[PDB]
């Protein structure tokens, strides 16, 4: 019988390679004109110490290196892109530093000279964070970094360092969404109460390899001199999370989950009364100032009742 020919090594390597690329679910930006645009929209990187997260092939890395950068540190998790990055460092004498690490855990507190550090109320320091990461990494990273801004530590020991990151279109939308909008949610409050957030532009998915199912939003973030809420991050996070869980219901329904059932009617009413908020407002209409009132009242309630802050309504429902 006539059987199909054997696959060559080229075909075997191709079959493994193409499937290895799809395996980590990423979107490479090979358009140097686009990576130039991201860098351009981020502002002037002249004499700025730049931290790039997940450089990969090095598209943005190249665009950063061509921008009068004082120094560029990159942290790369995949060791397969490390050789090419080293090659790129060779073309730029003393401009590139490479680390094989995880951005979710790597500390940059001392990666740059302490002299470039600035006061919080000062102008933003000569540190800038830029990166195009996979969607699974970018989302928890900003949430980690928002908490760092709250604590004024981590990347923000240098001061109010800027961020220019890519997010999936919908996430980028929520980050900048104003009150009343359908995309106004947790990320909206969590980012805006700590940062000035600007949606620079949106890159269509066609420009990425391989092609993602969605478009990619480019967002610029700058920490505020005075945060809109002055409570612990985890407290703000819990109130915001509970407020937005039932989107089609009165905010009273969601905020009520902060309190044990035996006190829920009275405490939820008291919370909204003291915070001076209409109990019938849908969560989408809750502004940063509404949450400041909710958080401040909830804080006083927690200080009065130490059982309150670690209450979880799911555990009670079981």
Asked if 134 touches ligand SAM (CB under 6 A), the answer is yes
Annotation-wise, does 72 bind a ligand?
A: no
Here the tokens at position 109 are 């507190």
Q: Is 27 in the site for ligand SAM (CB under 6 A)?
A: yes
CA–CA separation, 169 vs 103, rounded Å?
Answer: 22
Provide the Cα torsion 295, 242, 224, 175; round to 10°: -160
Report CA-CA distances (Å) from 213 to 30, 169, 175, 204. Answer: 17, 10, 20, 10
DSSP 62-80: HHHHTS--SEEEEE-S-TT
Q: How far is the CB of 57 from ligand SAM (least distance, A)?
A: 5
CB of 119 to ligand SAM, least distance (A): 30
Rounded to whole angstroms, the Cα distance separating 198 from 15 reads 41
Distance in angstroms (rounded) separating the CA atoms of residues 56 and 94 = 20
Task: Name the DSSP letter for residue 212.
Answer: P
Contact code string over 34-73 relative to ligand SAM, x by CB under 6 A = --------------------xxxx-xx-------------
Question: Smaller CB distance to ligand SAM: residue 31 or 305?
Answer: 31
Does 99 appear as a known binding residue?
no
CB-wise, 21 or 265, nearer to ligand SAM?
Answer: 21
Q: Give the footprint of ligand SAM on residues 76-115 (CB under 6 A).
A: 76-78, 81, 102-104
- Closest residue to ligand SAM, judged by C-beta, is 54
- The binding site for S-adenosyl-L-methionine comprises 29, 54, 76-77, 102-103, 132
Contacts with ligand SAM, residue ranges (CB under 6 A) = 26-29, 54-57, 59-60, 75-78, 81, 102-104, 132-134, 137
């Amino acid at each position: 019988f006539r059987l199909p020919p054997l696959p060559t090594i080229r075909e075997i390597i191709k079959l493994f390679g193409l499937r290895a690329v799809k395996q980590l679910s990423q979107n490479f930006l090979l358009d140097l004109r686009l990576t130039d645009k991201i860098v351009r929209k981020a502002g002037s990187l002249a004499d700025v110490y730049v931290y790039e997260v997940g450089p990969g092939p090095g598209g943005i890395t190249r665009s950063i290196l061509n921008a009068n950068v004082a120094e560029l540190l990159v942290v790369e998790k995949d060791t397969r892109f490390i050789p090419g990055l080293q090659m790129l460092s060779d073309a730029a004498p003393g401009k590139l530093r490479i680390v094989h690490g995880d951005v979710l855990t790597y500390k940059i507190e001392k990666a740059f000279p302490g002299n470039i550090r600035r006061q919080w109320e000062d102008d933003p320091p000569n540190v800038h964070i830029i990166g195009n990461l996979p969607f699974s990494v970018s989302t928890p990273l900003i949430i980690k970094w928002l908490e760092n801004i709250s604590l004024k530590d981590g990347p923000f020991v240098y001061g109010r360092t800027k961020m220019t990151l890519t997010f999936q279109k919908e996430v980028a939308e929520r980050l900048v969404a104003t009150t009343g909008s359908k995309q106004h949610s947790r990320l909206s409050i969590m980012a805006q109460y700590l940062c000035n957030v600007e949606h620079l532009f949106t890159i269509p998915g066609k420009a990425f390899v391989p092609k993602p199912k969605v478009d990619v939003g480019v967002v610029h973030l700058t920490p505020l001199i005075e945060p809109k809420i002055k409570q612990p991050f985890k407290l703000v996070e819990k109130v915001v999370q509970n407020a937005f869980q039932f989107r089609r219901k009165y905010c009273h329904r969601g905020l009520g989950m902060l309190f044990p059932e035996a006190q829920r009617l009275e405490s939820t009413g008291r919370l909204l009364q003291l915070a001076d908020i209409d109990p019938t407002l849908r969560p989408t209409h809750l502004s940063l100032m509404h949450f400041k009132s909710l958080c401040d009242v909830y804080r006083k309630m927690c200080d009065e009742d130490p059982q309150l802050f670690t209450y979880n309504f799911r555990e009670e429902l079981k």
